[PDB]
C-alpha cells in the first residue's frame, strides 16, 4: 500500500516534469522561429544591391 | 473450587490484557496512516518542479 501510494505520487511527479519540459520546448519553438527570421534578414542585408539606408 | 474461581478471574485478566493490547493497536493504526501521508508529501516535495513556496 505504501508502494502503491508512492507510485501514484511518482506518476504525478513524472507528469509535472513532463509539463516543465513541455513549456520549455514550446518557448524554444519561438526562439527557433525568431532566429530563422534573423537569418533571412541577414542574407537579405548581405546583398550588394542594398545601400546603407536599407 | 479455588481453581475454578481462579480460572474465572484468569479469563478476566486475559480479557483485560486483550483490551489494552487492542486499544494500543488501534492507536498505532492511525500512526501508520499519518506516517504514510507524511511519506506521500515527502515524495511530492522531493520533485524538482516545486519551488520554495510549495
From Swiss-Prot, chains A, B:
Compartments in which it is found: Secreted; Bacterial flagellum
Disulphide-bridged cysteine pairs: none
Superkingdom of origin: Bacteria
Function of the protein: Flagellin is the subunit protein which polymerizes to form the filaments of bacterial flagella. FlaD is not essential for flagellar synthesis and motility.
Subunit relationships: Heteromer of multiple flagellin subunits including FlaA, FlaB, FlaC, FlaD and FlaE.
Family: Belongs to the bacterial flagellin family.
Miscellaneous: V.cholerae is able to differentially regulate the flagellins within the flagellum maybe to produce flagella which are particularly suited for motility within a given environment.
Protein name, UniProt field: Flagellin D
Residues of the full protein shown: 55 to 108 of 377
Amino acid at each position: 500500500n505504501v508502494q502503491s501510494r508512492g507510485l501514484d505520487v511518482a506518476v504525478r511527479n513524472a507528469n509535472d516534469g513532463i509539463s516543465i519540459a513541455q513549456t520549455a520546448e514550446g518557448a524554444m519553438n519561438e526562439t527557433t522561429n525568431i532566429l530563422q527570421r534573423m537569418r533571412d534578414l541577414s542574407l537579405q542585408s548581405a546583398n550588394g544591391s542594398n545601400s546603407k539606408s536599407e
